[PDB]
């Protein structure tokens, strides 16, 4: 069981609800589990794409293909922008 740090997860959650809203510890842990499941789900499809393209290292295009294929196409443009800004 490998998860993103609970405090980082909780901070992102808190930003999405009213200032006085509260989050049960068990709900934070649940979202931790869900995020790892999300990473694994996308990565599995990206791995298949990588192999199909005669490669061995899963790249950004593989991840984006996976997101589009698996019902997360709306993530593609924001992700491309974020990566561009990150490397610029």
């Amino acid at each position: 069981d490998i998860y993103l740090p609970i405090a980082n997860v909780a901070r992102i959650m808190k930003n999405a609800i009213p200032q006085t809203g509260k989050i049960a510890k068990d709900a934070k842990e649940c979202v931790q589990e869900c995020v790892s499941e999300f990473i694994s789900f996308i990565t599995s499809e990206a791995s298949e794409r990588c192999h199909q393209e005669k490669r061995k290292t899963i790249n950004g295009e593989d991840i984006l293909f996976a997101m589009s294929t698996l019902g997360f196409d709306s993530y593609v443009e924001p992700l491309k922008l974020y990566l561009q800004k990150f490397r610029e």
């Binding site: 990473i39 990565t43 290292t57 950004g60």
Partner: protein, 82 residues
């Protein structure tokens, strides 16, 4: 700030799949942003059920309910069942 998320941890999660051995440097960066977008949408959707129940505390059952209402979350149906 999405840039705050630990990329080594994201890479470790990816590598839990035994078939996943080599990962580009850029892939964890993409996942850091994706994780923020995903957590935000999942939390917002759970909070719909929190508010519907006139509660101020978001609970696991609210997340379970949200998962059933969005086919993008189909992959989580058996992870967080109602």
């Amino acid at each position: 700030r999405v840039q705050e998320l630990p990329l080594a941890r994201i890479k470790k999660i990816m590598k839990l799949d035994e078939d996943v051995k080599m990962i580009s440097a850029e892939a964890p960066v993409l996942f850091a942003k994706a994780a923020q977008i995903f957590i935000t949408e999942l939390t917002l959707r759970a909070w719909i059920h929190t508010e519907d129940n006139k509660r101020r505390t978001l609970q696991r059952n609210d997340i379970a309910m949200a998962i059933t209402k969005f086919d993008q979350f189909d992959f989580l149906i058996d992870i967080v069942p109602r």
